Design a protein around this motif. Structure first.
Motif, PDB file in Angstrom:
ATOM      1  N   UNK A  23      45.188  29.949  38.696  1.00  0.00           N
ATOM      2  CA  UNK A  23      43.850  29.712  39.568  1.00  0.00           C
ATOM      3  C   UNK A  23      44.866  30.660  40.851  1.00  0.00           C
ATOM      4  N   UNK A  24      45.829  30.164  41.484  1.00  0.00           N
ATOM      5  CA  UNK A  24      46.385  30.682  42.709  1.00  0.00           C
ATOM      6  C   UNK A  24      46.998  32.177  42.982  1.00  0.00           C
ATOM      7  N   UNK A  25      47.192  32.560  41.036  1.00  0.00           N
ATOM      8  CA  UNK A  25      47.657  34.235  41.196  1.00  0.00           C
ATOM      9  C   UNK A  25      45.661  34.564  41.043  1.00  0.00           C
ATOM     10  N   UNK A  26      45.696  34.928  40.406  1.00  0.00           N
ATOM     11  CA  UNK A  26      44.464  35.077  40.616  1.00  0.00           C
ATOM     12  C   UNK A  26      43.407  35.185  42.400  1.00  0.00           C
ATOM     13  N   UNK A  27      43.230  34.465  42.702  1.00  0.00           N
ATOM     14  CA  UNK A  27      43.103  33.838  43.600  1.00  0.00           C
ATOM     15  C   UNK A  27      42.489  34.518  44.757  1.00  0.00           C
ATOM     16  N   UNK A  28      44.333  35.214  45.432  1.00  0.00           N
ATOM     17  CA  UNK A  28      43.716  36.775  46.373  1.00  0.00           C
ATOM     18  C   UNK A  28      43.635  38.401  45.399  1.00  0.00           C
ATOM     19  N   UNK A  29      43.791  37.960  44.523  1.00  0.00           N
ATOM     20  CA  UNK A  29      43.198  38.598  43.457  1.00  0.00           C
ATOM     21  C   UNK A  29      41.278  39.231  43.789  1.00  0.00           C
ATOM     22  N   UNK A  30      41.070  37.686  44.059  1.00  0.00           N
ATOM     23  CA  UNK A  30      39.879  37.815  44.255  1.00  0.00           C
ATOM     24  C   UNK A  30      39.554  38.531  45.771  1.00  0.00           C
ATOM     25  N   UNK A  31      40.305  38.250  46.200  1.00  0.00           N
ATOM     26  CA  UNK A  31      40.160  38.786  48.429  1.00  0.00           C
ATOM     27  C   UNK A  31      40.227  39.769  47.717  1.00  0.00           C
ATOM     28  N   UNK A  32      41.440  40.717  47.431  1.00  0.00           N
ATOM     29  CA  UNK A  32      41.369  42.167  47.542  1.00  0.00           C
ATOM     30  C   UNK A  32      40.145  42.870  45.934  1.00  0.00           C
ATOM     31  N   UNK A  33      39.338  41.741  45.747  1.00  0.00           N
ATOM     32  CA  UNK A  33      38.246  42.358  45.053  1.00  0.00           C
ATOM     33  C   UNK A  33      37.357  42.512  45.955  1.00  0.00           C
ATOM     34  N   UNK A  34      37.344  41.718  46.125  1.00  0.00           N
ATOM     35  CA  UNK A  34      35.869  40.814  47.546  1.00  0.00           C
ATOM     36  C   UNK A  34      36.018  42.425  48.863  1.00  0.00           C
ATOM     37  N   UNK A  35      37.755  42.631  49.215  1.00  0.00           N
ATOM     38  CA  UNK A  35      37.780  43.950  50.281  1.00  0.00           C
ATOM     39  C   UNK A  35      36.933  44.794  50.687  1.00  0.00           C
ATOM     40  N   UNK A  36      37.469  45.473  49.035  1.00  0.00           N
ATOM     41  CA  UNK A  36      36.852  46.169  48.565  1.00  0.00           C
ATOM     42  C   UNK A  36      35.683  47.054  48.811  1.00  0.00           C
TER      43      UNK A  36
END
Length: 36
Positions: A23-36
């Motif tokens: 979960x923690x790996x894709x967690x910040x991936x969700x944040x960088x998908x939300x920023x864009x």
DNA sequence: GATCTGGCCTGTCTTACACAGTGATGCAAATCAAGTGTGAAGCCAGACAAAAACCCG
């Protein structure tokens, strides 16, 4: 298949080679998908 | 004749007599779709050791 669908796993190893978890790996991936 | 009364005529008034079932919309909740490595519930290892149901001196 949607954007986040083909974005959470295609970029998963780019954090999974750093984050052991899965979960923690894709967690910040969700944040960088939300920023864009 | 004069009136009484009884019969027929409506005239109201009482209870009753068939509506949930159709196809459509439209939101809320659920799920589910991946990711990836986990542990957990059994699997089965030939062979060995404490209990329920009933035979047995």
């Amino acid at each position: 298949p949607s954007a986040f669908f083909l974005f959470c796993s295609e970029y998963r190893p780019k954090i999974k080679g750093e984050h052991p978890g899965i979960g923690d790996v894709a967690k910040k991936l969700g944040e960088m998908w939300n920023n864009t």
